[PDB]
Design an enzyme around this catalytic site. Structure first.
Site, short mmCIF file in Angstrom:
data_model
loop_
_atom_site.label_atom_id
_atom_site.label_comp_id
_atom_site.label_asym_id
_atom_site.label_seq_id
_atom_site.Cartn_x
_atom_site.Cartn_y
_atom_site.Cartn_z
CG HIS A 176 60.22 21.04 65.49
ND1 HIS A 176 59.53 21.84 64.60
CD2 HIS A 176 61.20 21.83 66.02
CE1 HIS A 176 60.07 23.06 64.57
NE2 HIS A 176 61.08 23.08 65.42
CE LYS B 3 59.39 28.31 64.70
NZ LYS B 3 59.86 27.08 65.42
CD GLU B 4 56.21 35.27 59.56
OE1 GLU B 4 56.25 36.49 59.79
OE2 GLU B 4 55.35 34.76 58.82
CB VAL B 5 56.82 28.46 58.85
CG1 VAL B 5 56.68 27.02 58.40
CG2 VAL B 5 56.11 29.39 57.86
CG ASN B 6 56.70 24.98 64.93
OD1 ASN B 6 57.84 25.20 65.36
ND2 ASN B 6 55.98 23.87 65.26
CB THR B 7 57.23 21.43 60.30
OG1 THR B 7 57.11 22.36 59.24
CG2 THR B 7 56.83 19.91 59.89
CG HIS C 164 67.82 22.92 63.74
ND1 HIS C 164 67.25 24.17 63.96
CD2 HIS C 164 68.02 22.83 62.39
CE1 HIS C 164 67.11 24.80 62.80
NE2 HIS C 164 67.57 24.01 61.83
#
Length: 121
Positions: free
Chosen positions: A17, A45-49, A117
């Protein structure tokens, strides 16, 4: 020193991140070279910022510059981010992403002052 019960999570947070030089066109290579998958195993992985900032500045959200929200901590100002969302593919290496850069108040899980997190929302 980062405490040792925190270090594994903190290092994983940095890897997944934190990247000041991230950009929307780099989603596929960033997800691939940082090996960011859906928890263990190889699903895409669907979404990761990626937060476009230094680790020290982001860590202030867990310190002086953040506010409590539920059990997490919210920045007191927007941060620049690039969000990578899975457009297609089910497992590495077929993952393809679309990236969006935006600005938003980021919400982090923190442990003893270190970020562990990122809340995607």
């Amino acid at each position: 020193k980062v405490p040792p019960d925190v270090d594994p999570r903190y290092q994983k947070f940095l890897r997944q991140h934190v990247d000041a030089d991230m950009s929307v066109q780099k989603c596929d290579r960033a997800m691939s070279i940082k090996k960011i998958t859906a928890g263990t195993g190889n699903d895409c992985k669907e979404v990761n910022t990626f937060i476009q900032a230094t680790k020290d500045r982001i860590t202030t959200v867990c310190g002086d510059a953040g506010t409590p929200v539920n059990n997490l901590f919210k920045s007191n100002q927007p941060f620049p981010v690039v969000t990578c969302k899975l457009k297609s593919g089910n497992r590495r290496p077929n993952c393809q992403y679309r990236g969006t850069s935006s600005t938003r108040y980021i919400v982090l899980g923190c442990d003893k002052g270190w970020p562990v997190h990122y809340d995607e929302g």
